[PDB]
Amino acid sequence: VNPTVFFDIAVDGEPLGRVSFELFADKVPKTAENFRALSTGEKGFGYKGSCFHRIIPGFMCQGGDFTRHNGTGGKSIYGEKFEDENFILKHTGPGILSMANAGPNTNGSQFFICTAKTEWLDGKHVVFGKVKEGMNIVEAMERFGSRNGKTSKKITIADCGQLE
């Protein structure tokens, strides 16, 4: 009903495991369809083969920049940027999937998965999904980041698509 998409994670080419996400298209339809379409790659571009560029242990894992691979690019299926759709949902705990941005109404393709309750981001970042299976794989990824976010290993989305 709400779609499910998966990411298969690899650490330096080696398989790590699969993370599945429920996307709240019932509450944030425009933001969720952008993530759904970038996971299937159906508009011609998307997340497959991209990497997690910033992982801060105890806080979140961030990725989605498939053009510069470092936090400075990415694009949405609606254009360079699109607006903050709403702020109904909050950052209630580990597993929350939320949009990274550069200020009001600058959403592109970058996202982050929280591994803690990060209530100070409420109302600044749009929440649109949550980890359904594989939270333990997110915890395992978390172990390759650091306080400044830089990763000790290359974490990539080796494959991705829609399950439901």
UniProtKB/Swiss-Prot annotation:
It catalyses: [protein]-peptidylproline (omega=180) = [protein]-peptidylproline (omega=0). GO terms for molecular function: cyclosporin A binding; heparan sulfate binding; integrin binding; peptidyl-prolyl cis-trans isomerase activity; RNA binding; unfolded protein binding; virion binding. Belongs to the cyclophilin-type PPIase family. PPIase A subfamily. Catalyzes the cis-trans isomerization of proline imidic peptide bonds in oligopeptides. Exerts a strong chemotactic effect on leukocytes partly through activation of one of its membrane receptors BSG/CD147, initiating a signaling cascade that culminates in MAPK/ERK activation. Activates endothelial cells (ECs) in a pro-inflammatory manner by stimulating activation of NF-kappa-B and ERK, JNK and p38 MAP-kinases and by inducing expression of adhesion molecules including SELE and VCAM1. This is Peptidyl-prolyl cis-trans isomerase A. Its EC number is 5.2.1.8. There is a cross-link at K27, K81 (Glycyl lysine isopeptide (Lys-Gly) (interchain with G-Cter in SUMO2)). The modification N-acetylvaline is found at V1. PROSITE patterns: CSA_PPIASE_1, CSA_PPIASE_2. Residues 6-162 form the PPIase cyclophilin-type domain. The gene is PPIA. Its main location: cytoplasm. It comes from Homo sapiens. Changing H125A: Loss of peptidyl-prolyl cis-trans isomerase activity and interaction with HCV NS5A. Loss of ability to stimulate MAPK/ERK phosphorylation.
